[PDB]
């Protein structure tokens, strides 16, 4: 709305590697996340196809399409409730203390639903899981929501 945030246009100049002021359709998922929006990858996929837009063939972009797609994704930020994130992992391990065994969270984050690479899974556990093999998800989900 501007509140006209012109820093979204300045961040589009940091993600366009050619400097022509266009951003390919394959970068739009990760740049919506870098502007403070977390649409799921199936949602980013649907919307695209919904609009008869093929992410399979070469794509370019213009700021005039990327701005309204970020504004259509911005209504879905009401789905980001931290009660359900901590209660999900609290149902994932027994006893009254928030600890996932290391390999349980790593294999679930790579193979269940939207596949996260094991390189990204190791980069998200690095520091929050110590050598006991127990990830405290009270501080883990706190630090994941700090970015």
């Amino acid at each position: 709305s501007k509140a006209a945030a012109d820093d979204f246009k300045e961040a589009f100049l940091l993600f366009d590697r050619t400097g022509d002021a266009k951003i390919t359709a394959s970068q739009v998922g990760d740049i919506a996340r870098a502007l403070g929006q977390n649409p799921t990858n199936a949602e980013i996929n649907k919307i695209l196809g919904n609009p008869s837009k093929e992410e399979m063939n070469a794509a370019a972009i213009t700021f005039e399409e990327f701005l309204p797609m970020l504004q259509a994704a911005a209504n879905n930020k009401d789905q980001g409730t931290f009660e359900d994130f901590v209660e999900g992992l609290r149902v994932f391990d027994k006893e009254g203390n928030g600890t996932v065994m290391g390999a349980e969270l790593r294999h679930v984050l790579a193979t269940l639903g939207e596949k996260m690479t094991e390189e990204e899974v190791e980069e998200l556990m690095k520091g929050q899981e110590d050598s006991n093999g127990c990830i405290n998800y009270e501080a883990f989900v706190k630090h994941i929501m700090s970015v």
């Binding site: 209660e87 999900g88 609290r90 006893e95 009254g96």
Partner: protein, 50 residues
Amino acid sequence: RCNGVLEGIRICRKGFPSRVLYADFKQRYRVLNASAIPEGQFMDSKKASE
């Protein structure tokens, strides 16, 4: 009808339809007051849901 099955349902419905089994109750809903519902469910499979 002649079994009694349909009559047991009747008498039930004069009644409490949906009936949740306790663990089946824990798991699915712990998350609602997460701390206090999880403790309840874990601490006593039944007493928990309570």
